[PDB]
Amino acid sequence: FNYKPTPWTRADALKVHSDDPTTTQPLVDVAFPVMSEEVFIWDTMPLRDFDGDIVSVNGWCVIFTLTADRNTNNPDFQDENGNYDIKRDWEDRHGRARICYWYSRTGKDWIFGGRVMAEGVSPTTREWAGTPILLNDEGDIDLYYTCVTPGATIAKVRGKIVTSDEGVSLEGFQHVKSLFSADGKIYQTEEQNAYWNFRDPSPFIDKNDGKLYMLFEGNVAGSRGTHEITQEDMGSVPPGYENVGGARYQVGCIGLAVAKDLSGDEWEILPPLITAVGVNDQTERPHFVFQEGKYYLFTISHKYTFADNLTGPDGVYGFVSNQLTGPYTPMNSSGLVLGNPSSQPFQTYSHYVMPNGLVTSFIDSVPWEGEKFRIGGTEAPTVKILLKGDRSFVVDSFDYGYIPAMKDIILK
Ligand SMILES: OC[C@H]1O[C@@](CO)(OC[C@H]2O[C@](O)(CO)[C@@H](O)[C@@H]2O)[C@@H](O)[C@@H]1O
Ligand SMILES: [Zn+2]
Ligand SMILES: [Zn+2]
User: Which residues of this UniProt protein bind Zn(2+) 2 (predicted)?
Assistant: First the structure.
C-alpha cells in the first residue's frame, strides 16, 4: 500500500484526439459477416498464461466469449407488429450473458464449443467478463470472471481443457469460489452508488516480486456526487478550462489486488493504479502488456462516460510505467491508443490489446441507411499496433476475429 494512484487528469483528457489515423481503428465494413446466426458474442477473452501471452494447447487456439442467444424467432422479442426487435434483443443481452468457448487451429473461423459452466454453477445467472488462465501443461484453467446481480463479485472457477485431433472440450468447471466485492474504503460500493462499477478481473504474476496480482475495474470509494476534484485530478489545464460541470460524478479507477499466495484463493485489496476522478466514470477491462521492461496498462472506455467539457472516442486508452505501482504516463500523451472513427463511433467495443500488438474487439453498432444501424454481436477485424516507448501506431489489419496464439503448450 506504499504508493499513490496516478491520476488520468482533465489536462491529459484535453489532449484526446479522435480520428488520428495512428490511433484509430479502421472502418468496419457496414456489410460485415456474422460468425453465428444462433448466438451473439461480445467481450472476447483469449486463453492466456500468467504473463499475458496468448496460449494454444496442442495446437488449438481458444477464446472465451460473453454469449447470448439470438431471439430471432422468439415471440417475446417481437414488437407490436410481430417483427423481431434485434435492438431490444441486443440491449437485453447483458441480462442473458453466459461464458462460452470456441476453438481453432488457425486463430480464426472459430468452432463453437458451448458453455464453460453448466447452467446453475455460476452463483449469479449473469456471467460477466474476466480472464481464463492456463495454470499448467496438465490443462488446468482458472476462469476469473464477474458474478453480477445481486451485487458485483470477482470469482474464479477451475476446470480442465482436453484436446483431440477433432477439437477441444472443457471439463470440470463446477465449483465457483467468490473472491471479493467492492470494500467501500478504497473501491466504491453499491451502497455508495447504485450505478457502481466493479468487474473484469485480469490476473498476472509480477516476476519482480513473484506475487500474483489482479487488475479490475472499480470506482474510487465515496457516496455518489461527494468526490472532491483535486488539483492533481485537474492537472495543468489551460486558461478557460476550469469549469468541470458535474465531473465529480465520474470516478472510474483501475483497481489492483494481491493474492495471499500463488493459489489465488485469498486476496488483499490495494490502492488503484490509475484514477479518473473528474475525467471518466468507466476504466473498463484493464489489462497489461509487459514489453521491454515496461508496464503497459490498457483500459477501455466510452465517449459518453467522459466528464462534462471533456470528450474522446470509444476505444482503448493506456498508460506506461517502468514500475507496477507507477508513476504512469498516458500513451500518446492523451491516453488514447485505439479509438473508433467518428463516422462509425460505436462500430466496435471491448478492445483487448495482446502482447503481440494484436487488438481484438467485437462489432457493436455500424451506421447503415438513413438513421438505421446494423447490430454486430460478432468479432471485428483484428488491428495490429506497435508500442514504442509511450507511443503507439496502427500498422496493420487482419481478418474478423483473428486471435492467434503466441505460444503453443504441449499437454502432458
Ligand atoms: O434487420 C437488421 C439487423 O439484421 C442484421 C443481422 O446481422 O443485419 C442483416 C442485414 O445485413 C445484410 O446481410 C448486409 O450485410 C443485409 O442484407 C441484412 O438486411 C443486423 O446486423 C441488423 O441490426
Ligand atoms: Zn508466458
Ligand atoms: Zn506440468
Answer: 137-138
